[PDB]
Amino acid sequence: LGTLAPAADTELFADTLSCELRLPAGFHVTADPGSHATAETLLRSLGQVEDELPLLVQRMDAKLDLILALIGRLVRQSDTRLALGTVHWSVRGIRLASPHAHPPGTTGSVLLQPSDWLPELLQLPADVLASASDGQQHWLWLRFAPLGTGLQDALERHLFRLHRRQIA
Amino acid sequence: AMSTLGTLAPAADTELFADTLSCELRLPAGFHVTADPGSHATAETLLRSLGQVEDLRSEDSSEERGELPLLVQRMDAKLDLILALIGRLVRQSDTRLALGTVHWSVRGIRLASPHAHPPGTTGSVLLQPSDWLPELLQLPADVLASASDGQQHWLWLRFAPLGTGLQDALERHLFRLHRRQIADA
Amino acid sequence: STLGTLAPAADTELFADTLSCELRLPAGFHVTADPGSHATAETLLRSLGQVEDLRSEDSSEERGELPLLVQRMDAKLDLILALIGRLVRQSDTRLALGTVHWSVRGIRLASPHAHPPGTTGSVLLQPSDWLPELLQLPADVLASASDGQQHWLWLRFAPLGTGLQDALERHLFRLHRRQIAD
Amino acid sequence: LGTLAPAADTELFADTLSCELRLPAGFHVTADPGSHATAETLLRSLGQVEDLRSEDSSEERGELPLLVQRMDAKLDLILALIGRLVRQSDTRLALGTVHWSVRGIRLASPHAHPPGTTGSVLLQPSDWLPELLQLPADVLASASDGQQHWLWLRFAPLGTGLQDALERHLFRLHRRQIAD
């Protein structure tokens, strides 16, 4: 129950906020990863819309909400959709389940939906630390490649906020 | 006013429409058993946003060149354009609901349905609130009554609790539609 | 253009004593009971005019305001608008591009089939070439004639209302101005 | 690679910033493309959102009203989402090395074309944005080396604004390149 790859499990979660939650997520092999700016922007933006001025600005915001809602729905109604499941996520890496096992050292990108109303996916380049199967299937232990100052700060804030939300 | 359809399900019609603003109108409406409404906040946001943008204007095209610079008017124009284009995109792929006469209140709705459904059936009422915006309002609901009048199967649906925010937005929406229907009369 | 001699009465009703522009653009008439929306038409026209604006001689960087954040927001809007435009152009049924005669009162355009005077429907046309947004205006056929090659229709827009009418008049005037260049 | 068309390489890259990079690009033989305005809007807008990337991280964190900051966030979300939608059904352009100047571009085409062929150079300027830059161009040289067919496209006059935008874009491209 996690101790089927204790070495990685410790590297990814020891002494750091590690959340256990259900969300669409998966590992995709590729030499073509994503961008840090993009992931940072996505994270901070989700957070900034946490919860006025001249009427024109108030109605501009109403228009924005309508646009986001429409576009949000169009994507969610045609996208492939990632495998929904229980994952263990920290600023260092993620413990999720994938269709097939992978050799440790396999490069790629972890794809996850940080929010469920918004179908925008978070793409984080990562490598496999371990690939042990038993939850009937193959579980992956992915280690994110260095995030950089900004993205890492965003991710910790995201996880911290996500945790308190859950702790209530 | 005074549609005898209520005589098909007296107790249901009373539950949904007695002592509350109940509007009889025509608009794209439907009911589906296999739900997927989303959140109360999405429905609430749609209704409120829709209200802020609709109901004509203050009969003036100015108001912007004053109090506001010009870079912002440009931005507002672009939003109007994007919104219209996104609405155009949607009409391209989405299956539209069929037009029908319905009786709508904050509690539920009475509408015609292709197939009958026994009371107790759970699902979602689908409605296109606007007209210029191809967006659907989905509201989880239960079938209170099901009856026929001879050519159409009628359903009386009671909405699942809407929550403070959405309820408020719907009440405002209904109140608005009402004065407007009476207005252009 | 001598197309007017095919229906003098209709041509006079639509273009006499008012600004009338002869130009090429996608435009069509479709028999329908779609009441369209004055507000939608007015919004499209005024918004279009706002973005078709400036970038004239004070182009490049017409700086006057201050906030840098708002400038970035405006850049984002330009990018969004451009992409959304492309998407719509993917699976949308394009209109027929032909020469037309347009005034605040109605329009003369080519049509697949002729129609009896009094036939009501909607005139559809693409105001700007760089954006796939269409303007819809309820109209009735005044005249219907052929030049031996095509069916020409003279459509009279139903009352536009004060706001839409003003927007359309502004639209046609700028259009006329723009084209009297060189 | 380049001697294949001495005169064409001198006309397009002599005494002017020329960058060597890899990105989706292609030449499409079309009757008439156009719109410098659309091309300039794209480059100028890209640049502004490109600088929004780190470097002081912000001209002023709080600054304007909080409602504004949040509307800006929604914009980021909308752009991302629409970008994702565009990718669901668009056609990617082959990645390739190209030499690009404000005057023209040299790229690898799946076929050759005679000098005078006209159309549009198609480029995807930013990896994060699925938007293509289209610039009317003519072919002034087509030659083949080992395998690939190489084309020398000479942009049709860009006009004051577009030219400025492209020169700025290329300079930023260059500067960022030196930052390896």
Q: What is the 3-state secondary structure (H, E, C) of A96-111?
A: EECCCCCCCCCEEEEE
For residue B26, give Cα distances in angstroms to A161, B5, B103, B177.
45, 15, 9, 12
C2 in D contact zone (CB under 8 Å): no
Structural contact between residues B157 and B141, judged by C-beta atoms closer than 8 angstroms: yes
The number of beta carbons lying within 10 Å of the beta carbon of residue A78 is: 14
Task: Work out the number of other CB atoms within 10 angstroms of the CB of residue C69.
Answer: 17
Of A44, A53, A64, the CB nearest to D74: A64
The shortest CB-CB distance from A68 to any of D53, D74, D128 is to D74
Number of other CB atoms surrounding residue D175 within 10 Å:
9
Which candidate in D23, D75, D81 is best for mutational testing of the A interface (most A CBs within 10 A)? Answer: D81
Q: Which tokens sit at B153? A: 């199967």
Measured in angstroms, the CA of D3 and the nearest CA of chain A are apart by 32
Domain coverage including residue C81: 1-182
Residue in B with minimal Cα distance to C62: B71
State the Cα–Cα distance between residues B47 and B31, nearest whole angstrom. 19
**Cβ contact, residue pair D85, C87, below 8 Å:** yes
Cα distances (angstroms) measured from residue C51 to each of A47, A124, C40, C124: 31, 37, 17, 21
C73 touches chain B (CB under 8 A): yes
Q: Do A62 and B46 touch (CB under 8 A)?
A: no
Distance CA A103, CA A84 (A): 23
DSSP one-letter code for B107:
S
Candidate from D73, D127, D128 with C-beta closest to A48: D73
| CA–CA separation, A19 and A13 (whole Å) | 9
Chains in contact with A, where contact means 3 or more Cβ–Cβ distances below 8 Å, are: B, D
D115 touches chain C (CB under 8 A): no
Q: Which uninterrupted H or E stretch holds B156?
A: strand B153-159
Closest residue in chain D to residue A32, using alpha carbons only: D127
Q: Which of B71, B76, B85 sits opposite C70 (nearest CB)?
A: B71
Rg (CA), chain C: 18
Question: Coil, strand or helix: which one is A16?
Answer: coil
Candidate from C50, C85, C133 with C-beta closest to B74: C50
For D108, list phi and psi in degrees, rounded to 5.
-95, 125
**Alpha-carbon span A94 to A141, nearest angstrom:** 6
What's chain B's length in residues?
185
Instruction: Please indicate whether, in this complex, the C-beta atoms of A120 and D81 are within 8 angstroms of each other.
Output: yes
CA distances from D104 to A117, D14, D139, D175, D176 (A): 45, 11, 10, 20, 21
Residue with tokens 């945790």: A163
Nearest to C135, CA basis, from C51, C52, C53, C36: C36
Is residue C98 within 8 Å of C27, Cβ to Cβ? yes
Phi, psi of C91 (to 5 degrees): -115, 45
Question: Using CB atoms, which residue from B71, B81, B132 is nearest to C65?
Answer: B71
What is the nearest CA distance from A23 to chain B, expressed in angstroms? 16
> Helices D66-89 and A55-76, interaxial angle, to 10°?
30
C-alpha torsion angle, residues D43, D45, D51, D53 (rounded to 10): -110
Tell me the C-alpha distance between D120 and D131, whole Å.
15
Task: Tell me how far apart the alpha carbons of residues B153 and B78 are, in angstroms, rounded to a whole number.
Answer: 45
Structure tokens that stand for A67 in this block: 């646009």
D79 contacts chain A (CB < 8 A)? no
Beta carbons within 8 Å of D146's beta carbon, 6+ residues apart: none
Breaks (C-N over 2.5 A) in chain C follow: none
Q: Residue B67, by phi and psi: left (phi above 0), alpha (psi -120 to 50) or beta?
A: left
Tell which of D64, D82, D88 to mutate to test the C interface (max C CBs under 10 Å).
D82
Half-sphere exposure of C148 (CA within 13 A, CB side): 0
Dihedral class, residue A101 (left if φ above 0, else alpha if ψ from -120 to 50, else beta): beta
Cβ contact, residue pair C65, B56, below 8 Å: no
The DSSP secondary structure of B38-102, one letter per residue, reads --HHHHHHHHHHHHHH-S--SS-S-SSTTTS-SHHHHHHHHHHHHHHHHHHHHHHHSPPPPEEEE
Phi, psi of B46 (to 5 degrees): -60, -50
Which residue's structure tokens are 């095209």?
Answer: B61
Resolution in A: 2.1
* Experimental determination technique: X-ray
| Contacting C residues, span 39-68, partner chain D, CB-CB under 8 Å | 55, 59-60, 67-68
Count of other CB atoms within 10 angstroms of residue C12: 12
Place of tokens 């496209």: D153
Cα–Cα dist A130/A104, whole Å: 5
Smallest Cβ distance to B46: which of A58, A69, A74?
A69
Helices and strands per DSSP (H, E), number in chain D: 4, 6
Preferred mutation among C69, C88, C91, C129 to probe D, highest tally of D CBs within 10 A: C69
CA D96 vs. chain centroid, Å, equals 12
Closest alpha carbon within chain B to A51: B41
Residue D14, CB half-sphere, CA atoms under 13 Å: how many?
6
To which H or E segment does residue C64 belong?
Answer: none
Cα–Cα distance for residue pair B125/C54, rounded to 1 Å? 47
User: How far is A37 from A150, CA to CA, in rounded Å?
Assistant: 8
Q: How far from chain centre, in Å, is Cα D80?
A: 20
Burial (0-12, 13-18, 19+ Cβ within 10 Å), B51: middle
Task: Name the token pair of A162.
Answer: 């996500």
C-alpha B180/C-alpha D156 separation (Å) is 56
C89 touching chain D per CB within 8 A = no
Give the residues across from B113 on adjacent strands: B153
Domain count, chain A: 1
Residue at B114: amino acid letter: P
Window 138-177 of B, Cβ < 8 Å to A = none
Structure tokens belonging to residue B59: 């009969």
How crowded is residue B60: how many other Cβ atoms within 10 Å of its Cβ?
9
What are the φ and ψ backbone dihedral angles of C106, each rounded to 5 degrees?
A: -175, -170
Burial class from Cβ neighbours inside 10 Å (0-12, 13-18, 19+) for residue D157 reads exposed
Check if the beta carbon of residue A137 is closer than 8 Å to that of residue A92.
no
User: How far is Cα A119 from Cα A115, in angstroms, rounded to an integer?
Assistant: 7
Q: Say if the Cβ atoms of D64 and C69 lie within 8 Å.
A: yes
Whether residue C37 and residue B131 make contact (CB cut-off 8 A), yes or no, is yes
Which residues in chain B are closer than 8 Å to A70, comparing Cβ atoms? 86-87, 90, 133, 135
Query: Among residues A36, B182, A45, B12, which one has the least CA distance to residue D79?
Result: A45
Question: Which amino acid does the sequence have at A35?
Answer: S
Partners of B78 on chain C (C-beta within 8 Å) are: 47, 51, 74, 77-78, 80-81
Minimal Cβ distance to C80: which of D52, D79, D160: D79
Long-range CB pairs of B3-6 (<8 Å, 24+ gap) are B3/B103, B5/B103, B5/B110, B5/B149, B5/B154, B6/B110
Both tokens assigned to C64: 């006057």
The first and second tokens of residue D29, run together, are 């033989």
CA distance D28 to D48: 28
Q: How many CA atoms lie within 13 A of C84 on its CB side?
A: 30
The CB density around residue B47, as the number of other CB atoms within 10 Å, is: 22
Query: Residues with Cβ < 8 Å from B57, sequence gap 6 or more?
Result: C163
How far is B84 from chain A, CA to nearest CA, in Å? Answer: 9
Say if CB C145 and CB C155 are below 8 A apart: no
B167 phi, psi to nearest 5 deg? -55, -50
Cα gap B178→B158, rounded to integer Å: 20
Q: CA B5, B10, B14, B16: dihedral to nearest 10 degrees?
A: -60
Phi–psi pair at C41, nearest 5 degrees = -65, -45
Name the phi and psi angles at A23, rounded to 5: -165, 150
Are A21 and A166 within 8 A, CB to CB?
yes
Interface test with D, best of C83, C97, C129 (most D CBs within 10 A): C83
Q: Which two tokens stand for residue C168?
A: 């359309």
**Cβ-contact D161, D8 below 8 angstroms:** no
Output phi, psi for B12, to 5 deg.
-75, -45
